Write a protein that holds these residues in place. Structure first.
Motif, PDB file in Angstrom:
ATOM      1  N   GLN A  91       0.820  -1.201   0.000  1.00 48.97           N
ATOM      2  CA  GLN A  91       0.000   0.000   0.000  1.00 48.97           C
ATOM      3  C   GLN A  91       0.858   1.256   0.000  1.00 48.97           C
ATOM      4  O   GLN A  91       0.597   2.185  -0.767  1.00 48.97           O
ATOM      5  CB  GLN A  91      -1.000  -0.043   1.154  1.00 48.97           C
ATOM      6  N   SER A  92       1.922   1.290   0.801  1.00 43.30           N
ATOM      7  CA  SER A  92       2.725   2.502   0.812  1.00 43.30           C
ATOM      8  C   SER A  92       3.455   2.675  -0.504  1.00 43.30           C
ATOM      9  O   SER A  92       3.575   3.792  -1.006  1.00 43.30           O
ATOM     10  CB  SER A  92       3.704   2.499   1.979  1.00 43.30           C
ATOM     11  N   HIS A  93       3.922   1.577  -1.090  1.00 45.49           N
ATOM     12  CA  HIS A  93       4.681   1.714  -2.321  1.00 45.49           C
ATOM     13  C   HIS A  93       3.799   2.047  -3.503  1.00 45.49           C
ATOM     14  O   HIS A  93       4.239   2.756  -4.409  1.00 45.49           O
ATOM     15  CB  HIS A  93       5.567   0.499  -2.536  1.00 45.49           C
ATOM     16  N   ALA A  94       2.552   1.595  -3.492  1.00 41.82           N
ATOM     17  CA  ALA A  94       1.645   1.980  -4.562  1.00 41.82           C
ATOM     18  C   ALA A  94       1.108   3.390  -4.366  1.00 41.82           C
ATOM     19  O   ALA A  94       1.108   4.195  -5.304  1.00 41.82           O
ATOM     20  CB  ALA A  94       0.487   0.992  -4.624  1.00 41.82           C
ATOM     21  N   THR A  95       0.668   3.719  -3.158  1.00 42.52           N
ATOM     22  CA  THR A  95      -0.152   4.906  -2.965  1.00 42.52           C
ATOM     23  C   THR A  95       0.658   6.118  -2.566  1.00 42.52           C
ATOM     24  O   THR A  95       0.317   7.241  -2.958  1.00 42.52           O
ATOM     25  CB  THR A  95      -1.226   4.646  -1.903  1.00 42.52           C
ATOM     26  N   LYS A  96       1.715   5.924  -1.792  1.00 39.63           N
ATOM     27  CA  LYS A  96       2.520   7.048  -1.353  1.00 39.63           C
ATOM     28  C   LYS A  96       3.770   7.212  -2.200  1.00 39.63           C
ATOM     29  O   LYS A  96       4.030   8.294  -2.731  1.00 39.63           O
ATOM     30  CB  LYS A  96       2.884   6.910   0.130  1.00 39.63           C
ATOM     31  N   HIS A  97       4.536   6.142  -2.372  1.00 40.96           N
ATOM     32  CA  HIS A  97       5.803   6.261  -3.073  1.00 40.96           C
ATOM     33  C   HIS A  97       5.648   6.136  -4.570  1.00 40.96           C
ATOM     34  O   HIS A  97       6.517   6.611  -5.303  1.00 40.96           O
ATOM     35  CB  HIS A  97       6.773   5.207  -2.560  1.00 40.96           C
ATOM     36  N   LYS A  98       4.561   5.516  -5.026  1.00 46.70           N
ATOM     37  CA  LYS A  98       4.247   5.382  -6.444  1.00 46.70           C
ATOM     38  C   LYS A  98       5.348   4.626  -7.183  1.00 46.70           C
ATOM     39  O   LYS A  98       5.923   5.095  -8.165  1.00 46.70           O
ATOM     40  CB  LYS A  98       3.918   6.733  -7.091  1.00 46.70           C
ATOM     41  N   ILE A  99       5.612   3.418  -6.702  1.00 43.30           N
ATOM     42  CA  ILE A  99       6.708   2.594  -7.196  1.00 43.30           C
ATOM     43  C   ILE A  99       6.116   1.568  -8.154  1.00 43.30           C
ATOM     44  O   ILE A  99       5.420   0.652  -7.703  1.00 43.30           O
ATOM     45  CB  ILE A  99       7.444   1.887  -6.052  1.00 43.30           C
ATOM     46  N   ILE A 101       5.686  -1.763 -10.326  1.00 41.73           N
ATOM     47  CA  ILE A 101       6.143  -3.109 -10.025  1.00 41.73           C
ATOM     48  C   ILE A 101       7.452  -3.398 -10.741  1.00 41.73           C
ATOM     49  O   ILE A 101       8.291  -4.155 -10.242  1.00 41.73           O
ATOM     50  CB  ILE A 101       5.029  -4.126 -10.334  1.00 41.73           C
ATOM     51  N   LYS A 102       7.676  -2.760 -11.892  1.00 39.98           N
ATOM     52  CA  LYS A 102       8.935  -2.924 -12.603  1.00 39.98           C
ATOM     53  C   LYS A 102      10.121  -2.616 -11.704  1.00 39.98           C
ATOM     54  O   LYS A 102      11.166  -3.264 -11.796  1.00 39.98           O
ATOM     55  CB  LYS A 102       8.951  -1.993 -13.814  1.00 39.98           C
ATOM     56  N   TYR A 103       9.989  -1.617 -10.839  1.00 37.81           N
ATOM     57  CA  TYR A 103      11.117  -1.287  -9.977  1.00 37.81           C
ATOM     58  C   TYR A 103      11.326  -2.351  -8.917  1.00 37.81           C
ATOM     59  O   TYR A 103      12.448  -2.526  -8.431  1.00 37.81           O
ATOM     60  CB  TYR A 103      10.935   0.070  -9.307  1.00 37.81           C
ATOM     61  N   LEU A 104      10.261  -3.055  -8.537  1.00 32.24           N
ATOM     62  CA  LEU A 104      10.418  -4.184  -7.637  1.00 32.24           C
ATOM     63  C   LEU A 104      11.096  -5.343  -8.337  1.00 32.24           C
ATOM     64  O   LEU A 104      11.853  -6.082  -7.710  1.00 32.24           O
ATOM     65  CB  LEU A 104       9.063  -4.595  -7.070  1.00 32.24           C
ATOM     66  N   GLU A 105      10.857  -5.504  -9.637  1.00 32.36           N
ATOM     67  CA  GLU A 105      11.651  -6.451 -10.405  1.00 32.36           C
ATOM     68  C   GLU A 105      13.112  -6.026 -10.407  1.00 32.36           C
ATOM     69  O   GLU A 105      14.007  -6.843 -10.174  1.00 32.36           O
ATOM     70  CB  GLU A 105      11.114  -6.523 -11.825  1.00 32.36           C
ATOM     71  N   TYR A 146      -1.254  -4.288  -5.990  1.00 32.82           N
ATOM     72  CA  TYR A 146      -1.243  -3.195  -6.952  1.00 32.82           C
ATOM     73  C   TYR A 146      -2.449  -3.275  -7.867  1.00 32.82           C
ATOM     74  O   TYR A 146      -3.082  -2.253  -8.159  1.00 32.82           O
ATOM     75  CB  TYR A 146       0.022  -3.265  -7.789  1.00 32.82           C
ATOM     76  N   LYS A 147      -2.790  -4.479  -8.328  1.00 29.47           N
ATOM     77  CA  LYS A 147      -3.926  -4.609  -9.226  1.00 29.47           C
ATOM     78  C   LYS A 147      -5.202  -4.204  -8.520  1.00 29.47           C
ATOM     79  O   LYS A 147      -6.036  -3.487  -9.089  1.00 29.47           O
ATOM     80  CB  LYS A 147      -4.057  -6.033  -9.740  1.00 29.47           C
ATOM     81  N   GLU A 148      -5.360  -4.632  -7.272  1.00 24.37           N
ATOM     82  CA  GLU A 148      -6.520  -4.255  -6.482  1.00 24.37           C
ATOM     83  C   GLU A 148      -6.671  -2.745  -6.438  1.00 24.37           C
ATOM     84  O   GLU A 148      -7.774  -2.211  -6.636  1.00 24.37           O
ATOM     85  CB  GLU A 148      -6.318  -4.825  -5.085  1.00 24.37           C
ATOM     86  N   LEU A 149      -5.558  -2.041  -6.252  1.00 25.45           N
ATOM     87  CA  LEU A 149      -5.516  -0.588  -6.178  1.00 25.45           C
ATOM     88  C   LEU A 149      -5.510   0.084  -7.535  1.00 25.45           C
ATOM     89  O   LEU A 149      -5.561   1.316  -7.587  1.00 25.45           O
ATOM     90  CB  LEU A 149      -4.262  -0.145  -5.425  1.00 25.45           C
ATOM     91  N   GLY A 150      -5.453  -0.670  -8.626  1.00 25.39           N
ATOM     92  CA  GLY A 150      -5.416  -0.052  -9.929  1.00 25.39           C
ATOM     93  C   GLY A 150      -4.145   0.702 -10.192  1.00 25.39           C
ATOM     94  O   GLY A 150      -4.124   1.604 -11.028  1.00 25.39           O
ATOM     95  N   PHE A 151      -3.073   0.364  -9.493  1.00 25.25           N
ATOM     96  CA  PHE A 151      -1.849   1.129  -9.618  1.00 25.25           C
ATOM     97  C   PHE A 151      -0.963   0.538 -10.701  1.00 25.25           C
ATOM     98  O   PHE A 151      -0.688  -0.666 -10.701  1.00 25.25           O
ATOM     99  CB  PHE A 151      -1.084   1.175  -8.301  1.00 25.25           C
ATOM    100  N   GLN A 152      -0.512   1.395 -11.609  1.00 28.35           N
ATOM    101  CA  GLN A 152       0.471   1.017 -12.609  1.00 28.35           C
ATOM    102  C   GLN A 152       1.702   1.897 -12.455  1.00 28.35           C
ATOM    103  O   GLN A 152       1.595   3.060 -12.063  1.00 28.35           O
ATOM    104  CB  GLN A 152      -0.114   1.163 -14.014  1.00 28.35           C
TER     105      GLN A 152
END
Ligand code: HEM
Length: 152
Positions: A91-99, A101-105, A146-152
Motif C-alpha cells: 500500500q505505501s509503495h503503490a499509494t505514497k511512493h508510487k513505485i 512493479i517494474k522497480y520491484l523487479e 497493486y492490481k486491487e488498487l489499480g496502480f500502474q
C-alpha cells in the motif's frame, strides 16, 4: 509456492545478509540506483546523490538499506505467510511512493546481483533458484495488491 527445502535455502542465504544487513542494503540500493537511475528519482532524500561515490558515502542510504532489508527479511521469514507484513508495504509503495512493479523487479534482480558480488562462489545455483522464487512470490503478492488498487 516454495517447498520447505526452498525456504530453507532462502533463509540460509538470508543469514549471509543478516551478518551485514547495512552493507548488503547499501549495495542493493546502489545497484538499483546506478543500474536504473530513474529509481533514484522516486527518493526525494536520495535524488541529490549525483555519483556512486556520494551514494557509497551516504549514511542515510545505508540506513535506508537496513530498513528495506529488515522489512524484506521479516517477510521472507514468514515463508510465504506474509499477508500482514506485505499489505502495508504494497500500500505505501503503490499509494505514497508510487513505485511501479517494474522497480520491484529491478530491486529483486539487484539482490541476486549483490549476493553474487558479495559471496562469489558461495551463492549456489539452488540458492539462487530459491531466492529468486521467494522474490518472485514477494513481487507477485505485491502485484496482486497493486492490481486491487489499480496502480500502474
Ligand atoms: C524489496 C523491496 C522493498 C522493500 C522491502 C521496501 C521497504 C520499504 C520500507 C520498509 C520503507 C519505509 C516504510 C514505508 O514507507 O512503507 C520504504 C520506503 C520507501 N520505499 Fe521501499 N521497499 C522496497 C522497494 C522499493 C523500491 C524498488 C523503490 C523505488 C524504486 C522504493 C521506494 C521507496 C521510497 C521512495 C520510500 C520512502 C523513502 C523515504 O522517503 O524515507 N521501495 N520501503
Amino acid at each position: 509456492g516454495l517447498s520447505d527445502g526452498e525456504w530453507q535455502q532462502v533463509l540460509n542465504v538470508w543469514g549471509k545478509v543478516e551478518a551485514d544487513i547495512a552493507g548488503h542494503g547499501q549495495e542493493v540500493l546502489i545497484r538499483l540506483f546506478t543500474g536504473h537511475p530513474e529509481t533514484l528519482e522516486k527518493f526525494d532524500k536520495f535524488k541529490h546523490l549525483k555519483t556512486e561515490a556520494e551514494m557509497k558515502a551516504s549514511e542515510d542510504l545505508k540506513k535506508h538499506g537496513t530498513v528495506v532489508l529488515t522489512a524484506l527479511g521479516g517477510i521472507l521469514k514468514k515463508k510465504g505467510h506474509h499477508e500482514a507484513e506485505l499489505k502495508p508495504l504494497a500500500q505505501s509503495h503503490a499509494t505514497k511512493h508510487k513505485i511501479p512493479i517494474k522497480y520491484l523487479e529491478f530491486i529483486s534482480d539487484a539482490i541476486i546481483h549483490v549476493l553474487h558480488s558479495k559471496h562469489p562462489g558461495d551463492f549456489g545455483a539452488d540458492a539462487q533458484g530459491a531466492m529468486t522464487k521467494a522474490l518472485e512470490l514477494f513481487r507477485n503478492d505485491i502485484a496482486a495488491k497493486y492490481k486491487e488498487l489499480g496502480f500502474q
